[PDB]
């Protein structure tokens, strides 16, 4: 299926991320030392301090996702020993089309892991990438696998989602059922 569903998002923008050279270099804010609202500060601060250790662990195997959250901004990060290196992930406008087939063209028997995308712009000209985690766009089409039977997947395509079946497009979808660990507080 040489066919290509065009896409748009909203304020889940498509970004592309360049590898950061060590232009900028950072670390994390380490544990900070710490009359009914006295007691709330000291727990919160200790929580932040304990939760620090977690952020540490996660920074070592997925730093991009740490820095994106810490700076509320899509960024590509990677470690240089015990320190990080960052760049802004550039945004994408222009049409973002999602090839309908996940079959690999010549190598009839092998497949792609995640849907191929054609998109323009990003300094500049056409690019033949493929759909990364959560609207990363990857410049490279080399997430491959061999074609299973019963391949059903749901990829985050911009604002929405996109269902694929038997390594081939189906529709768009909104994944209706959210699950949450969010703990709201009745006020």
């Amino acid at each position, epitope marked *: 299926r040489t066919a290509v569903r065009a896409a748009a998002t909203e304020r889940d923008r498509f970004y592309v991320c360049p590898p950061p050279s060590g232009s900028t270099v950072v670390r994390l804010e380490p544990e900070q030392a710490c009359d009914m609202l006295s007691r709330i500060a000291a727990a919160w601060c200790e929580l932040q301090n304990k939760d620090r250790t977690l952020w540490g662990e996660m920074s070592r195997l997925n730093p991009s996702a740490v820095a994106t959250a810490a700076l509320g901004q899509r960024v590509s990060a990677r470690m240089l020993g015990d320190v990080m290196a960052i760049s802004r992930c550039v945004e994408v406008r222009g049409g973002v089309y999602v090839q309908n087939s996940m079959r*690999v063209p*010549g*190598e*009839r*028997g092998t497949c792609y892991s995640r849907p191929l995308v054609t998109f323009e712009h990003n300094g500049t000209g056409v690019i033949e990438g493929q759909l990364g985690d959560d609207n990363e766009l990857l410049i490279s089409r080399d997430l491959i696998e*061999p*074609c*299973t*039977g*019963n391949h059903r997947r749901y990829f985050k395509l911009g604002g929405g989602y996109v269902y694929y079946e038997d390594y081939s497009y189906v529709r768009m979808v909104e994944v209706p059922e959210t699950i949450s660990t969010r703990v709201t507080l009745n006020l």
Partner: antibody
Amino acid sequence: EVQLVESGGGLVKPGGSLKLSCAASGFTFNDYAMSWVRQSPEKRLEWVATISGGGSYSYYPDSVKGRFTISRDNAKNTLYLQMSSLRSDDTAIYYCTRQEGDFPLFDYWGQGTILTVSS
Amino acid sequence: DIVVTQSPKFMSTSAGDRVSITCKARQDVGSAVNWYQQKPGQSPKLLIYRASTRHTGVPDRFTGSGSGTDFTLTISSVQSEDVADYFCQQYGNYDLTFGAGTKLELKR
């Protein structure tokens, strides 16, 4: 008709080497991914190797990995299988196979390999 | 590997009668199982794919079924030629695997 002949087998000393081959007719060759499937001295059909339609990719069970090399050659529609460190329990019939889009579909004739002793 | 267990080895029926066979994959495959026939002396022959949908050639007494882990071939009214060895494979996962096989048998 989609038809399917293969050859190479015979007797081989353990640790030996042997190349099988497989003549594909009656279908547009590289459109499909080719495979190699082996029936034990009874049953089991072990999947041996599967190569991609173009050539670039191929896949293996850990059992046969390293030892066996699948290859194809689309100039004249022929699929090969290169066995080495050839081992006694590789003794089996070898059916060459055409896959549809995901799995074997027209099984070939059969082609017997054996190991160790003397005629 | 997705070990696929085809019990039983033997399976004995009678002329024109009901038969079926069971394959239990160890993880979910959904619709993605296959059954082949091997009449004595020949190679295998593809019967049913994606579970329960036939190959272009197979008589319509043959019917596969189910999905998930519990897949079962069934043959409506047996004939002479339908005696054979009967093999299931799955294709949700490389490494590719087949069942142990099941042998048919008439009664006359």
